[PDB]
Design an enzyme around this catalytic site. Structure first.
Site, mmCIF file in Angstrom:
data_model
loop_
_atom_site.group_PDB
_atom_site.id
_atom_site.type_symbol
_atom_site.label_atom_id
_atom_site.label_comp_id
_atom_site.label_asym_id
_atom_site.label_seq_id
_atom_site.Cartn_x
_atom_site.Cartn_y
_atom_site.Cartn_z
ATOM 1 N N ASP A 1 1.037 -1.595 -0.177
ATOM 2 C CA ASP A 1 0.040 0.095 -0.428
ATOM 3 C C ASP A 1 0.512 1.582 0.113
ATOM 4 O O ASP A 1 1.879 1.460 0.913
ATOM 5 C CB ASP A 1 -0.982 -0.279 1.360
ATOM 6 C CG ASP A 1 -2.127 1.004 1.896
ATOM 7 O OD1 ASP A 1 -1.446 2.132 0.809
ATOM 8 O OD2 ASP A 1 -2.334 1.161 2.443
ATOM 9 N N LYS B 1 2.936 11.272 -3.540
ATOM 10 C CA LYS B 1 1.519 11.087 -4.163
ATOM 11 C C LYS B 1 0.717 11.797 -4.666
ATOM 12 O O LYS B 1 -0.003 12.045 -5.770
ATOM 13 C CB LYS B 1 0.977 9.867 -3.477
ATOM 14 C CG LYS B 1 0.274 9.322 -3.668
ATOM 15 C CD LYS B 1 -0.242 8.067 -2.469
ATOM 16 C CE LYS B 1 -1.658 6.999 -3.180
ATOM 17 N NZ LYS B 1 -2.553 6.824 -2.290
ATOM 18 N N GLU C 1 -7.133 1.020 -4.480
ATOM 19 C CA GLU C 1 -7.554 0.706 -3.071
ATOM 20 C C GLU C 1 -8.304 0.639 -2.801
ATOM 21 O O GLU C 1 -8.495 -0.709 -2.519
ATOM 22 C CB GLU C 1 -6.221 2.176 -1.903
ATOM 23 C CG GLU C 1 -5.464 2.578 -2.004
ATOM 24 C CD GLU C 1 -5.081 3.833 -2.767
ATOM 25 O OE1 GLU C 1 -5.847 4.717 -2.048
ATOM 26 O OE2 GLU C 1 -4.002 4.167 -2.858
ATOM 27 N N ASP D 1 -12.989 6.138 3.849
ATOM 28 C CA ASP D 1 -11.525 5.925 3.809
ATOM 29 C C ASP D 1 -10.860 7.356 4.406
ATOM 30 O O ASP D 1 -10.990 8.119 3.697
ATOM 31 C CB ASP D 1 -10.742 6.117 2.744
ATOM 32 C CG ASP D 1 -8.919 5.106 2.215
ATOM 33 O OD1 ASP D 1 -8.551 5.639 3.023
ATOM 34 O OD2 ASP D 1 -8.147 4.965 1.628
HETATM 35 MG MG LIG Z 1 -4.495 4.830 2.244
#
Ligand SMILES: [Mg+2]
Ligand SMILES: Nc1ncnc2c1nc(Br)n2[C@@H]1O[C@H](CO)[C@@H](O)[C@H]1O
Length: 390
Positions: free
Chosen positions: A12, A73, A177, A201
């Site tokens: 991840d 990211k 994800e 999330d």
């Molecule tokens: Mg995450």
């Protein structure tokens, strides 16, 4: 005849923290790094003598802000001119430069000014995750599944693959994800028929809601919604503002202009915030916070809940928007899955459970580990090379 194959890993690659897992002996092992941490900060720091990655980078950020890189990211696969990039640059202490309309991070490293592409910084984080796994397995690792957000476009997905290749990894697949979180619970192994799954999330800096449909193990992303300005750091900011006011009332002193005291306050607030997820109260004890004054205080979970009340309630707006976009009603959702450390907050769980009329939430897999867990499950499936019997 045939030598045993190395295990493949699931990574991840997170905005703030990264996590690595391996599926062996019918189960996933989330691998702790050399400091005993099950998640590793997605930070890279540069000095005159070293390049530090993970906990070692994040632990020296206070005195080296210009040469410690985080949030790569947010830059990966984007153009320098992109409005997202331009706005984010105002919050970062490190330099972001323009190279042919592509962002690069510029730092002082080993006596020189060096610029790196976001994929190069991400490859350094992937190198650390690969070494964490090899320290546990006791042999070199080659194969990995890496996850990305569901909204990532083709350029963002290709730059993630490029980061993997630079790190010496064979990228088996780039998976979403929310799909990885669903796989972690085996939600693709429930047989024939359609299932609607909502993934909730809540991260350090952003909030994402995804609605997936699963039919015979096939995943379809039906809707995505969220809030880019809602995360764990905003709850930390509310506690910081609260204790700064408290110090002013108690000692008649404003600490807000001493960076060290604010940083020590914020660090203590983040830990008190974590304590309040399992306790009804938490102590705050800082020695010589400002002008040699010791700051020994407390905060109840009820007071913390009141301080962040509007922020917690606002997580339901993207839930309702995602349900409208998917053209579904709340009763039609079969499974609710929690992702991100901020989902451990009891009040966040209570609000969401109340919204879905008392339904159970899947939270048995640590929410900061669920994505890597599902990525490791997928990695083991992808390397199978069974030949059918007669
Ligand atoms: Mg995450
Ligand atoms: N137990 C927990 N209760 C409340 N919050 C938590 C917990 N554990 C984690 Br991890 N967090 C927060 O999750 C975010 C991950 O980037 C950060 O803001 C962490 O502070």
């Amino acid at each position: 005849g045939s030598m045993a194959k190395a295990a493949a890993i699931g990574i991840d690659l997170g905005t703030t923290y990264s996590c690595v897992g391996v599926f062996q002996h019918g189960k996933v092992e989330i691998i702790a790094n050399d400091q005993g941490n099950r998640t590793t900060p997605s930070y890279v720091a540069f000095t005159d003598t070293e390049r530090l990655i993970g906990d070692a980078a994040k632990n020296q950020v206070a005195l080296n802000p210009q040469n410690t890189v985080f949030d790569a990211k947010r830059l990966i696969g984007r153009k320098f001119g992109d409005p997202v990039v331009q706005s984010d640059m105002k919050h970062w202490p490190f330099q972001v430069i323009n190279d042919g309309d592509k962002p690069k991070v510029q730092v002082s490293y080993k006596g020189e000014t060096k610029a790196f592409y976001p994929e190069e910084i991400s490859s350094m984080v992937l190198t650390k995750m690969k070494e964490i796994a090899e320290a546990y397995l006791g042999y070199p690792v080659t194969n990995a599944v890496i996850t990305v957000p569901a909204y990532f476009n083709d350029s963002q997905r290709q730059a993630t693959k490029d980061a993997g290749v630079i790190a010496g990894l064979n990228v088996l697949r780039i998976i979403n994800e929310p799909t990885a979180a669903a796989i972690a619970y085996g939600l693709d192994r429930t047989g024939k028929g359609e299932r609607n799954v909502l993934i909730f999330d809540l991260g350090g800096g952003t909030f994402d809601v995804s609605i997936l449909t699963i039919d015979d193990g096939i995943f379809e992303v039906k809707a995505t919604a969220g809030d880019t300005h809602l995360g764990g750091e905003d709850f930390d900011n509310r506690l910081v503002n609260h204790f700064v006011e408290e110090f002013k009332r108690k000692h008649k002193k404003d600490i807000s202009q001493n960076k060290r005291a604010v940083r020590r306050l914020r660090t203590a607030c983040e830990r008190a915030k974590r304590t309040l997820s399992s306790s009804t109260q938490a102590s705050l004890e800082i020695d010589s916070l400002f002008e040699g004054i010791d700051f020994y205080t407390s905060i109840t979970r009820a007071r913390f809940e009141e301080l962040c009340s509007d922020l917690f309630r606002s997580t339901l707006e993207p839930v309702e928007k995602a349900l409208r976009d998917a053209k579904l009603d709340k009763a039609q959702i079969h499974d609710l899955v929690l992702v991100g450390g901020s989902t451990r907050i009891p009040k966040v769980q209570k609000l969401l459970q109340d919204f879905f009329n008392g339904r159970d939430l899947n939270k048995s897999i640590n929410p900061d580990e669920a994505v890597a867990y599902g990525a490791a499950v997928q990695a083991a499936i992808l390397i199978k090379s069974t030949r059918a019997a007669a």
